[PDB]
């Protein structure tokens, strides 16, 4: 049982030991396109880049590079796109990707401002009446509604393809209380958020991969996808003891470097998968307790 | 900081 393994690591105290062990075992592939000089200004951080083999490609003829990776969990049967917080010049590429990849939801795990350091550009509209128009990529983006909550906000947006006039609804799930290099307040607030995303249908396979991003697209975004994927496998395999989080995290790291940034984020991942297993085991109604426990009203 | 692992 994975519950045992956790209590061992805690008493033993070897979380950073386990952590550093995974950095050591993580894959490492070429990143040539990311390192081209013409692409210097399309990366927020110089030590964070997509592998050539899983990088998302813009369907534009000029320059097809965006700092985003397709994480295709074959067994779990779910694909994610992890990406950096858009830069002032890459907002148009962000929504071009969202359109071309047919995504229906975007999960944003950081805030535009975080401890005085700008970690993301304001790439979605905040007022219904001031919609954004990205001319380089020919897209229009309109806020349609929002549902503010004590620690997260769900927005509904209309993404229009000016070239064809076609339009699509995009769900924006913004988690506003997750500090960089930090962890959510509780497994409950986290799982309540995850399951909100799940219930929206954004994670369904009729849709393109959900886009997940934070500042760099590896640390908080990593924690989110690990938890969802482990919960998926426990359900698909039919046994909670089956899943080896370390083996799952290493699988994800074949697709984008650096997923999960602190030893405490790794611990929260065990914690959250352990809690979420209650739901997978059949205890349908623990979900309503998570909503209650998270104080999503205020 | 331009570098993801900062001091």
Numbering used by the authors:
A (entry chain A): 2 to 299
B (entry chain D): 1034 to 1040
What does the paper say about this structure?
To determine the substrate-bound form of the D181A/Q262A double mutant we used the bisphosphorylated activation loop sequence of all four members of the JAK family as substrate peptides. Incorporation of the D181A/Q262A mutations leads to a five order-of-magnitude reduction in catalytic activity compared to WT PTP1B20. Nevertheless, in multiple co-substrate structures of this mutant, we observed that both steps of the reaction had occurred; dephosphorylation of the pTyr, presumably via the usual cysteinyl phosphate intermediate, as well as hydrolysis of that cysteinyl-phosphate. Surprisingly, the products of the phosphatase reaction (both the phosphate and the tyrosyl-peptide) were clearly visible in the active site in all four structures. The phosphate was not present as a cysteinyl-phosphate intermediate nor as the pTyr substrate but rather as free phosphate. This suggests that dephosphorylation had occurred within the crystal, as well as subsequent hydrolysis of the phosphoenzyme intermediate, but that neither the phosphate nor the tyrosyl-peptide product had completely diffused out of the active site. Accommodating both of these species within the active site necessitates a reorientation of both the tyrosine (back and across, towards solvent) and the phosphate (towards Q266, where it has displaced the water molecule W1 that Q266 coordinates) compared to previous structures. The occupancy of the phosphate was refined as ~60% suggesting that a proportion of it had left the active site but that the majority still remained. Our structure suggests that incorporation of the D181A/Q262A mutations have corrupted the usual catalytic cycle in which substrate is released prior to hydrolysis of the cysteine phosphate. In some of the JAK activation loop structures with the D181A/Q262A double mutant the register of the peptide in the active site is possibly scrambled, with populations of both the first and second tyrosines being present in the active site.
Protein Tyrosine Phosphatase 1B (PTP1B) is the prototypical protein tyrosine phosphatase and plays an essential role in the regulation of several kinase-driven signalling pathways. Here we identify PTP1B as an inhibitor of IL-6 and show that, in vitro, it can dephosphorylate all four members of the JAK family. Dephosphorylation of substrate is initiated by nucleophilic attack by the active-site cysteine (Cys215) to form a phosphoenzyme intermediate followed by hydrolysis of the cysteinyl-phosphate to release free phosphate. Asp181 acts as both a proton donor, enabling protonation of the tyrosyl leaving group, and as a proton acceptor, receiving a proton from the water molecule that hydrolyzes the phosphoenzyme intermediate.
